[PDB]
C-alpha cells in the first residue's frame, strides 16, 4: 500500500498525518511519502497569520461549516497542553468592524463569547459603526508546519523535494494512492477553471502591545481586501490585500502603502511600530473546496486520487476537518480494495 | 507659592502633573518640586503590572468608585493616541475565575463588554467553576512613570533625590503646601495605624503567546493571594502573593514556587516560559485611601498638607481620579489664601 501525498503546506501535512495515525495499525506495508516542490519556510501556509475565522457568508457546500467546526473543537481541546507553544496555538480575542448592521455569522456558536460591539467600543473606531467581538484561536502557519513535520518524521513518513509533472508519472513509479494537496497550483496537474489565486500581501510588524485582532470589512472592496491586524506570537500581522488572478509572487510597493495606511488609520499607535518582514502568497480560491476521489485511468489498473485543495482564505481554519474527510475517503478505498 | 510633592510613584507624579496643568496659569510664582527617596525604576509602582481593576467588593468610601471610573474614562480616551506606547497603555481582555457564583462587580459597566463565562470557556480551567470575561486596560507602571517624568520635566518641575525626615523639615525650608504621596511608608512622617504593607511578589516571564489576563479568586486565601497572569507589553506578570504586615523587600524562594506552581496549574503552556525577572513591592493597604487636607501647625503660620496615600492593590487603577481630587483640594487652599 504505497501512498504519495503531493503538497507540504498545511493541507498535505495534516492529511498525511491524519491518514497515518488512522491506518498504520490496519495496514501492514503502509508507506507514506510526501512529495513537495516547496517546504515549510516557503509555502503559502507560511504567509498566513493563522487566525481561525471562516468567511462571513454560508459555504456553498454546508459540509465546510462542519469541517471548520471540527477544526476549532480539536484545536481548542489542545490549547492547554504542554505542546501548544510548539504548534504555535493560542487564544486571541478581537473585533470585526463594519459600516452598517449585518447578520450574525453561521459560526457564531463555534467561537467563544461571540457578541455585538457596545457603543463604547465602537467609539474607538471613527470609520466604523458596527461590529462584533469574540475570542477565537491562532494557529501560526510556520510553527504548525514544523510541528506536523517532526510528527510525520517520527512516524516514518519520508519527504522528498520534487515537482511532480503529472499524476501518471507518480502512479507509473508505483503509488497505489495519490493525495493531491497542491493548493493554488492544482491546475498544473489537472485543469480546473474554478481554481484561481487570491494574491495576498502581508507585513510583519513589532507591536507587542497589540493584544486583539481587528478585522475590517468593506463590501465595496471585497473580503480580505480591507485592513486587518492580527497579533501573532512574536510579531503582528498587518494586511488587507486580496487580488483575484494575480500570480505575481513579489512584494508590491502599492500594496505595502495600502497595508500601512489602512492599518495606521485603524490603529494609530502602529506608526511607531518596527517593520520586520513582508511576504506574498496565493490563497487558492474556488467556489468550494475540492475534496473528493477520482480513479485515474493509467496503465493496467487505475490508481486512486484524493483531491484536497482550494481552501482560499481559510485553510488553517478548516484544515483538520478536511484531513479527517480525506482519511475517511482513504478508508473507503481500502474496503473496496478488500484490505480492511 | 512653593509646592512640595513627597513621593515619585504613580501617586506623587500624577498629582504633581495634575496640579501643574490645572494651576500654572492662575499662579505666577508657582514652583513645584518633587522630593523622593526612590525613583522610577525602584518604586512599588514599577513592580505593578498595571491592570485596571478595582476590588470586587464595594469601597468603604464610594467616592473611590468614581475615582476609578474617572481614571478609566481618561485612559480609554487616550488608548488610541500615538503616545500610548510611550505611556505603556493598551487594551486587554481576560478572565476572572471563581469556584462559586458571586455577584457582578460595581464596575461592570465601566469595563468594556463585561459578561459571564460560557461553559465552553470554563472547560479550559478545571479548578474553576464560574467567572467573568471583559476588556480592560493596562497602564504599565515603569513606562507610565517614565512618561510622567518627561512631562513634568518639560514643565520645569524639579526632582530631588532625598529622604524627608518630617513635614516640619520641609515647611522650615520654605514650602507653603506639601503633597503627601509617600505610599506604604507614610506612617514614618505621621503615625497611621490603619496603613499597612500588603507585600506582593511577582515573576516576569517570556510568554508572548499569552494575550489575556487571567485572575483567580479564592475567599479561603483572599484577594491577590490567588494565582494571576497578566501579559504586559514585553513580558508577562506571574503573581498571587499578598501578605499583610510583611516588610521584607526581598524575593522569597517559597513565594517564587507558589507563583510558579499556581500559574502553571492555571496555564500549563507556561512550563516552557523563560523567567526574566522577579520583584517584590508593598501594597499600601488601608481601609480607605487617605486623600484629605490637614493644616500642620508649624512655626509662625501653619503649612497646608494634602495627604494622598493608601491606594493598596489599586493605585494605577485609581490614580487619575485621586490626582484630580488632590488638585481640587489645592484649589480650595488657594481661595482661602485669597490667591485665585
Ligand atoms: C495572506 C494570507 C493570510 C491568511 N490568513 C489565514 C488565516 O489568517 N486563517 C486561515 O485559516 N487561513 C488563512 N489563509 C489561507 C491559507 O494561507 C491557505 O488557505 C492555506 O495555506 C492553503 O494551503 P495548502 O496546503 O492548500 O497550500 P500551500 O500551503 O501553498 O501548499 C501547497 C504545497 O503543494 C506543493 N505543490 C504544488 N504543486 C506541486 C507539484 N506539482 N509538485 C510538487 N509539489 C507541489 C507546494 O510546493 C506546496 O508544498 C491566509 C492566506 C493568505 C494568503
Ligand atoms: C506585586 C504588586 C502588584 C501590583 N499590581 C497592581 C496592578 O496590576 N494594578 C494596579 O492598579 N495596582 C497594582 N499594585 C498596586 C500599585 O502598585 C500601588 O497601588 C501603587 O504603586 C502605589 O503607588 P504610590 O505612588 O502610592 O507609592 P510608591 O509607588 O511606592 O511611591 C512612593 C514614593 O514615595 C517615596 N517616599 C516614601 N517616603 C518618603 C520619604 N520619607 N521621603 C522621600 N520619599 C519618600 C518613595 O521613594 C517613592 O518614591 C500592585 C502592587 C504590588 C505590590
Ligand atoms: O488575508 C486573510 C486574513 C485572514 C484570513 N484569511 C486570509 O486570507
Ligand atoms: O497584585 C495585583 C494584581 C492586580 C492588581 N493589583 C494588585 O495588587
Curated annotation (Swiss-Prot), chains A, B:
It is linked to Schizophrenia: A complex, multifactorial psychotic disorder or group of disorders characterized by disturbances in the form and content of thought (e.g. delusions, hallucinations), in mood (e.g. inappropriate affect), in sense of self and relationship to the external world (e.g. loss of ego boundaries, withdrawal), and in behavior (e.g bizarre or apparently purposeless behavior). Although it affects emotions, it is distinguished from mood disorders in which such disturbances are primary. Residues 216-228 are annotated as: Active site lid that may open upon substrate/product migration in and out of the active site and close to increase the hydrophobicity of the active site, to make the hydride transfer reaction more efficient. PROSITE patterns: DAO. Pfam families: DAO. Belongs to the DAMOX/DASOX family. Its EC number is 1.4.3.3. Keywords: Amyotrophic lateral sclerosis, Cell projection, Cytoplasm, Disease variant, FAD, Flavoprotein, Neurodegeneration, Oxidoreductase, Peroxisome, Phosphoprotein, S-nitrosylation, Schizophrenia, Secreted, Synapse. Changing residue 224 to F: Decreases activity. This is D-amino-acid oxidase.
Amino acid at each position: 500500500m504505497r501512498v504519495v501525498v503531493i503538497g507540504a503546506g498545511v493541507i498535505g501535512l495534516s492529511t498525511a498525518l491524519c491518514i497515518h495515525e488512522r491506518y498504520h495499525s490496519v495496514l501492514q506495508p503502509l508507506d507514506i511519502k510526501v512529495y513537495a516542490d516547496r517546504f515549510t519556510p516557503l509555502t503559502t501556509t507560511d504567509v498566513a497569520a493563522g487566525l481561525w475565522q471562516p468567511y462571513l457568508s454560508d459555504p456553498n457546500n454546508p459540509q465546510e461549516a462542519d469541517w471548520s467546526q471540527q477544526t476549532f473543537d480539536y484545536l481548542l481541546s489542545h490549547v492547554h497542553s504542554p505542546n501548544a507553544e510548539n504548534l504555535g496555538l493560542f487564544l486571541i480575542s478581537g473585533y470585526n468592524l463594519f459600516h452598517e448592521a449585518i447578520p450574525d455569522p453561521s459560526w457564531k456558536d463555534t467561537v467563544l463569547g461571540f457578541r455585538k460591539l457596545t457603543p463604547r467600543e465602537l467609539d474607538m473606531f471613527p470609520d466604523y459603526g458596527y461590529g462584533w467581538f469574540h475570542t477565537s484561536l491562532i494557529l501560526e502557519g510556520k510553527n504548525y508546519l514544523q510541528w506536523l513535520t517532526e510528527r510525520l518524521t517520527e512516524r516514518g513518513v519520508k519527504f522528498f523535494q520534487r515537482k511532480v509533472e503529472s499524476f501518471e508519472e507518480v502512479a507509473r513509479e508505483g503509488a497505489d494512492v495519490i493525495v493531491n494537496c497542491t493548493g493554488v497550483w492544482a491546475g498544473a496537474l489537472q485543469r480546473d477553471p474554478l481554481l484561481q489565486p487570491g494574491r495576498g500581501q502581508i507585513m510583519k510588524v513589532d507591536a507587542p502591545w497589540m493584544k486583539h485582532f481587528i478585522l475590517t470589512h468593506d463590501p465595496e472592496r471585497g473580503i480580505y481586501n480591507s485592513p486587518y491586524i492580527i497579533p501573532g506570537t512574536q510579531t503582528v500581522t498587518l494586511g488587507g490585500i486580496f487580488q483575484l488572478g494575480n500570480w505575481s509572487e513579489l512584494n508590491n510597493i502599492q500594496d505595502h502603502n495600502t497595508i500601512w495606511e489602512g492599518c495606521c488609520r485603524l490603529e494609530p499607535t502602529l506608526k511607531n511600530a518596527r517593520i520586520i518582514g513582508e511576504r506574498t502568497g496565493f490563497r487558492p480560491v474556488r467556489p468550494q473546496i475540492r475534496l473528493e476521489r477520482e480513479q485515474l485511468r493509467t496503465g493496467p489498473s487505475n490508481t486512486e486520487v484524493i483531491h484536497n485543495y482550494g481552501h482560499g482564505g481559510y485553510g488553517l481554519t478548516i484544515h483538520w476537518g478536511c484531513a479527517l474527510e480525506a482519511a475517511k475517503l482513504f478508508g473507503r478505498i481500502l474496503e473496496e480494495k478488500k484490505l480492511s
